Amino acid sequence: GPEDVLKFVGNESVVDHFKLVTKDGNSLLIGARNTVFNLSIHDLVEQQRLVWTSPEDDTKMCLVKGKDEEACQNYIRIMVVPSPGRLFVCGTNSFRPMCNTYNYTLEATKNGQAVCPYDPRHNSTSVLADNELYSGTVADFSGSDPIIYREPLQTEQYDSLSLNAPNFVSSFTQGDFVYFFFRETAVEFINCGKAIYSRVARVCKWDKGGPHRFRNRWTSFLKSRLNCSIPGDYPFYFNEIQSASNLVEGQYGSMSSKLIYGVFNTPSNSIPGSAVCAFALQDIADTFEGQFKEQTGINSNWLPVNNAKVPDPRPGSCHNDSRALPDPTLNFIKTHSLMDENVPAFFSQPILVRTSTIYRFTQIAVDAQIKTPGGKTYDVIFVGTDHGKIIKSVNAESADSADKVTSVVIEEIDVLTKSEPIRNLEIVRDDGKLIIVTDSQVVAIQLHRCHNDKITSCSECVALQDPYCAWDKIAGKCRSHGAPRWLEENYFYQNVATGQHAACP
Amino acid sequence: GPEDVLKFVGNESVVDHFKLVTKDGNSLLIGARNTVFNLSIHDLVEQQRLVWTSPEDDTKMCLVKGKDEEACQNYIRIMVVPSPGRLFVCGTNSFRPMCNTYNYTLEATKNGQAVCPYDPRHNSTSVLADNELYSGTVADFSGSDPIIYREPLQTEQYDSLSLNAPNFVSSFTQGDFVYFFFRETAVEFINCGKAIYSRVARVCKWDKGGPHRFRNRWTSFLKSRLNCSIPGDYPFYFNEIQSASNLVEGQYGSMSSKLIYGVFNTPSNSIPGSAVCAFALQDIADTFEGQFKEQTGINSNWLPVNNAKVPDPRPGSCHNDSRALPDPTLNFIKTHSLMDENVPAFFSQPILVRTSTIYRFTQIAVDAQIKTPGGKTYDVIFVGTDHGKIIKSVNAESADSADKVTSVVIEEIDVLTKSEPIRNLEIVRDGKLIIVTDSQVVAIQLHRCHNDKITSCSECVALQDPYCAWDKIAGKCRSHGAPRWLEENYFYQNVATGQHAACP
Ligand SMILES: *[C@@H]1O[C@H](CO)[C@@H](O[C@@H]2O[C@H](CO)[C@@H](O)[C@H](O)[C@H]2NC(C)=O)[C@H](O)[C@H]1NC(C)=O
Ligand SMILES: *[C@@H]1O[C@H](CO)[C@@H](O[C@@H]2O[C@H](CO)[C@@H](O)[C@H](O)[C@H]2NC(C)=O)[C@H](O)[C@H]1NC(C)=O
Ligand SMILES: *[C@@H]1O[C@H](CO)[C@@H](O)[C@H](O)[C@H]1NC(C)=O
Ligand SMILES: *[C@@H]1O[C@H](CO)[C@@H](O)[C@H](O)[C@H]1NC(C)=O
C-alpha cells in the first residue's frame, strides 16, 4: 500500500482514543487509557508524559470476573483548556470517575460524575465554553441514567422522553448554543418496534435554573430527529450514527454554507452499509422553530400539536432571566421536547454511501476548502472504517431530477493493519498530513498524495480529480497546494467533474 | 460454465412463465404469452400447439402509449385439469380476461373476472380442488380490488383490512384447506411507515356463504403474518416474499416434518439481500389457533383481543352448514381477521441467506428426499436469481447452544445468460431441472455428480452432494436414481458428519 511517512506505535494495549490539537501551542495532547502523551505536531516527539495509576482502593473495588483485568482502569476521556490556562483531564479510574485538575501540579480535584463515563465504551463527548464545560454521559455505575452535565444542571431523573440509551458522538458550540449528536432509542417507535433514530439536541449557554424546585432541571431542552435517507420513490433510512465532524464555514457570512458532516450507518441487525450524511445548522434550526411531536398516553388521546398550544415565551432561546420564566410552559416542555419533523439532508442525498462492502464507517475528518485552480472551493471528507481503510473524497453538485450527487472516491488505500479499527481521526492545519488515532497505534501520513506518488504515467494526476493535484508542462512534478508557492500565475488543468475528455494522451 | 445438456429457445419475446408437470401423462404444458406449448418431458419436443390471437376489438381498446405494443396481449396465466379431462386455460387477452374451457374443441367460454389478472404483473396464483377452483387476483381494470374467488364467493368490496396491495405467489390445498402466500402492506404498520409483511391465509373447502346480506362475503377467511428473520439479540426481518414451494412429506405421517419452503427478500428501498425461510403447516396452525390482532380507531381505544371475545363457533373451520352459522361472529370476523402472533421460522433461523451479493432470489424448487448412504433423508433446495445464477443447496440439522444451521452451497455455477432473470423453476420426477425464463427454458441435470471431471478425487468428496458417491475399483462417481447396485457396498460421504480426509 502506501509508504509510512510517520508511524507511532506508542502503546500495546492502552488504545488511545482522545486527542487535542492546538496549533498556536503546536502540541498534540492525545488522550489514552491510564496514560497521557504530549507530542510535537511536526515529528510526533513526546514532550512530557502524564501517567496516572488508578489508586489501589479504586482498582480493588472492581472485581467483575467477566472482562475487567484488561479493562476497568483509568480511561482519560475528556480534556479541555480552561481560561486560567490550567490542565483539565478526567479519567474513568476503574469506574470511579473523579476529575483532577492540573505538569503534575494538582490544583484541585472534583467529582467526575456525569462528565466521565463509568464504562469504557465510546458513548460520551465533551465541549468547552467560555465559563462552563458541556459533557453528556451516564451518571450511575450501570449507566442507566445518561444526562448532560453543565455545572450544576441536570435533566429529569430517568427521563425516557428526553434520552433513552444514547451514544453521544459529537458536541459543539455556536452562538451561545451547544449542540449534541447521539443515537437514542425512540419511545414513539417502540410501539412499532425497536429502532434507533439519530436525534440532535441544543441548549442555551446560560440556563440558571427553574422556579419552584425546578432549579435542578433544564427549561430550554429540545431535540429533533436527523433524517439520513437515500431519497427517491421510497425512502431508505440510516438509523445509527458513529461520528460527526465540526462545523464548516466558507468565506464570508453572507453565504449560507454552514455544513456539519455526520457519519451514519445501518443498525446491528441490518447490513454493514454506512452513509455519510451532511446536515446544516440552518436545516437544524428549521425543525426547532417547527412544532413539537405529539405524545399521548394509553387512556388519553391527543392529536399532533397545533400553533394555539405554544406559549408566549419561545422554547429554546437564551433569556436574560430563566428563573423569572413562567411555569405553564415549564410543565409543557418535558412532554413536548421532541420536534415533529426531522432535519432534511443536505441537497436531499447523503454525501458518501458504501453498502456492498463489509466494513462500516467509524470516524470522520474534514479538511478546509482549498483554492482549486478552477476558481471554486469545495469541502474535503476523510472517513475511516472498522477495517482501517481510509477514503478520501470531495463533492461537486450535479443537477438531475433526483438530485444525483457524484461521490468522488479519490483513493481507498488502506494504511494500517486490517485487524485494528480506526476510532479517531484528525487533520493538521502546518504541512499537509493526517492523524489516524487507532487502538494499536496512531500513524501520520500525508493529507493528499499528489506528491510522493509516481506511476510513471501522466494520467495519474488527471484521473484522480484531486483538488490539490495539478500538472506542469516544462517540469514533471505533480503540483500540490499549500506546500509550494508559484512565482507567478500559470496554467493548470483540472477535471473536477468539469467534462474534460482527455489531457495527457 | 456447464454444458447445455438440453437447449430450448422456443420464442424470442413470448416470455413463457407458466408450466404444468403431469408425470402419468408425461407431458409439460408450459404456459406463455399469445401461445401455449405441450411438450414431452424426455427431450422437450412439442406435441401440439394452441395459438390464441387476441381479437381485434379487444386489442384496439388497449392503447397505452407508454409500453403496450410489446405487451397488452394474451397472457395465459392459470391452467388446471378438471375431472372430466377438459382443458381450462385463461389468458389476460389485452386486459379482457375471459376463461376458455375445452385440442381446439371450445366447449364453452365464460368471463374470467377475479380469476385472471388484467395486468401482466406476477401477482396472481391458482390451485385446483375436487369441485371448485381457487384463484387470487385483481378484479378491476386498474387492479385496486384484489380478491380470492372460489365460485362464486367474493371478499368485501375494496377491503383494506383483509388485502392491501398483495402479490399472490403461491397456493396449495391440504385437507379441505387452501392456503395462499402473498405480500401485502400491513395497515397497522402503515401507521408507522410503508413496509410489506408476508402474510399467509387459508380458507375452508365448502363455504356456501352467509346469512343476512353476508351471502356475498366470506365467513371463514383468516390470515397471519410470516416471521422470516435472523434470530439473535436483535431480530432482522425480511419483508418481501418472491415464491414458495409445495408441501414436503417425509416417510410416514407420525413425523411432524411437513414444511413449505418460501423465498423471501428485502424491500425495494433496502439492499438486495434475500433469505430462504421455511414454514411448516404445524407452525401455521399455531398462529391461526392463537388470538386475533387488535384493531382500534382514531377516537375509540381497544386492548389486544382476549379469549373472552371468541365465540362458541371456532373461526376458520369447515362446517356442514355455513348459512346456519350465527351473525355475531360474522360481524366479528371482518374486524379481527388478522392474527396477533406471527408464524416462527423453521428451527428459528432461515435456511439460506445471501446478503452481500447483488443478485436477488426470484424462485424456488424443492427435490424429494433421496436415500443417502448415511441412512438419513434431507431436503434439497434449488433457488434461482434475477442475475440468472442458480444455486442448489441442502441443509443438515446441527446441535449447538446457539441454533446455527450450516447452509450447504453445493455449486453456484451460472447456466443461462447474465441478462435474463429466472422466473419459474421445476424439478422432474431421469434427474433433470427445468429453468423457465423469459428468453428461453433450459433443461439441465439436477445433480452434477456425473458429467463433472476435474481428474481429482477430492472434488467429489468435498461437494457434500447427497447423490454423489465414490467407488474404489471403478473411477465412476456414483449417483442415486439412475444406477442400480448389484449388491450392498461401501460409500463414504461427509454431509457435515465430521470426516477429515479420504482421497489424499
Ligand atoms: C506540551 O509540550 C510543549 C513543549 O514543551 C509545551 O509548550 C511549551 O511549554 C513550556 C513550558 O510551559 C513553555 O515555556 C513554552 O513556551 C511552550 N512552547 C514552546 C514552543 O516551547 C506545552 O505547554 C505542553 N502542553 C500542551 C498542552 O501543549
Ligand atoms: C399434452 O398432450 C398429451 C398428448 O399425449 C396429452 O396426454 C394424452 O395423450 C394421449 C395420447 O397422445 C391422448 O389420447 C389424450 O387425449 C391426452 N390427454 C388428454 C387429457 O387429452 C395431455 O393431456 C396434454 N396436456 C398436458 C397438460 O399434458
Ligand atoms: C426523510 O427524507 C426522505 C428524503 O427526502 C423523505 O422521502 C422522507 O419522507 C423523510 N422522512 C419523513 C418522516 O418525512
Ligand atoms: C421472529 O422469530 C425470531 C425467531 O425465529 C424471534 O427471535 C423474533 O422475536 C420474532 N419476531 C417477530 C416480530 O416475529
Cell reading at A201: 439536541
Ligand 2 within 6 A of B20 CB? yes
- CB of B168 closer than 8 Å to CB of B180: yes
- CB of B116 closer than 8 Å to CB of B97: yes
- The DSSP bridge partners found for residue B278 are B261
Name chain B contacts of A228, Cβ cutoff 8 Å: none
By C-alpha distance, which of A383, A352, A376, A380 is closest to A368?
A380
- Percent helix, strand, coil in chain B (nearest 5)? 5, 30, 65
Angstrom distance (rounded) from CA A359 to CA A418: 11
Q: DSSP readout, A61-116? A: H---SSS-SSSSS-BEEEEE--TT---EEEE-TTT--EEEE------EEEE-TTTS
Indicate the domain borders of chain A. 6-479
**Is the CB of B271 less than 8 angstroms away from the CB of A268?**
no
> Cβ < 6 Å from ligand 3: which residues?
A 227, 229, 231, 235, 342, 348
Task: List the resolution, Å.
Answer: 3.6
Name chain A contacts of B302, Cβ cutoff 8 Å: none
DSSP class of residue B153 equals B
Instruction: Return the CATH architecture of domain A6-479.
Output: 7 Propeller (2.130)
* Residue in the block written with cell 457434500: B464
- CB of A363 closer than 8 Å to CB of A388: no
- CB of B103 closer than 8 Å to CB of B87: yes
Cell reading at A442: 496512531
A176: left (phi over 0), alpha (psi -120 to 50) or beta: left
- CB of A351 closer than 8 Å to CB of A278: yes
Cell reading at B27: 407431458
Report how this structure was experimentally obtained.
Answer: X-ray
Q: If contacts are CB pairs under 8 Å, which of residues 85-104 in chain A contact chain B?
A: none
Residue A344 alpha carbon to ligand 3 centre in Å:
7
- CB of A88 closer than 8 Å to CB of A102: yes
Name chain B contacts of A235, Cβ cutoff 8 Å: 269
Burial (0-12, 13-18, 19+ Cβ within 10 Å), B328: exposed
Cell reading at A235: 425512502
Phi then psi for residue A348, to 5 deg, are 55, 50
Angstrom distance (rounded) from CA A419 to CA B257: 44
A-to-B residue pairs, Cβ atoms closer than 8 angstroms: 41
- CB of A228 closer than 8 Å to CB of A275: yes
> What H or E segment, with its residue span, contains residue A460?
helix A459-464
Angstrom distance (rounded) from CA A144 to CA A119: 11
3-state secondary structure string across A184-246: EECHHHHCCCCCEEEEEEEEECCCCCCCCCCCCCCCCCEEEEECCEECCCCCEECCEEEEECC
Give the number of other Cβ atoms within 10 Å of residue B317's Cβ.
11
Long-range contacts of A252-260 (CB under 8 A, 24+ apart): A256/A280, A256/A282, A258/A282, A259/A346, A259/A379, A260/A284
Angstrom distance (rounded) from CA B504 to CA B502: 6
Q: How many CA atoms lie within 13 A of B367 on its CB side?
A: 28
**Is the CB of B194 less than 8 angstroms away from the CB of A234?**
yes
Amino acid in position B404: K
Work out whether strand B108-111 and strand A222-225 pair parallel, antiparallel, or are unpaired.
Answer: unpaired
Name chain B contacts of A356, Cβ cutoff 8 Å: 356, 358
3-state secondary structure string across A319-352: CCCCCCCCCCCHHHHCCCCEECCCECCHHHCCCE
Angstrom distance (rounded) from CA A421 to CA A440: 9
Residue A148 CA from chain centroid, whole number: 17
**Is the CB of B230 less than 8 angstroms away from the CB of A271?**
no
Atom from ligand 1 closest to the CA of residue A81:
27
Query: Which residues, other chains included, contact A165 with Cβ-Cβ below 8 Å and sequence gap of 6+?
Result: A146, A184, A185, A196
Instruction: Say whether domain B18-478 belongs to CATH 3.30.70.260.
Output: no
Ligand 2 within 6 A of B27 CB? yes
First-to-last CA distance in chain A?
Answer: 27
Phi then psi for residue B289, to 5 deg, are -70, -25
Which one of the ligands is nearest to A346 CA?
A: 3
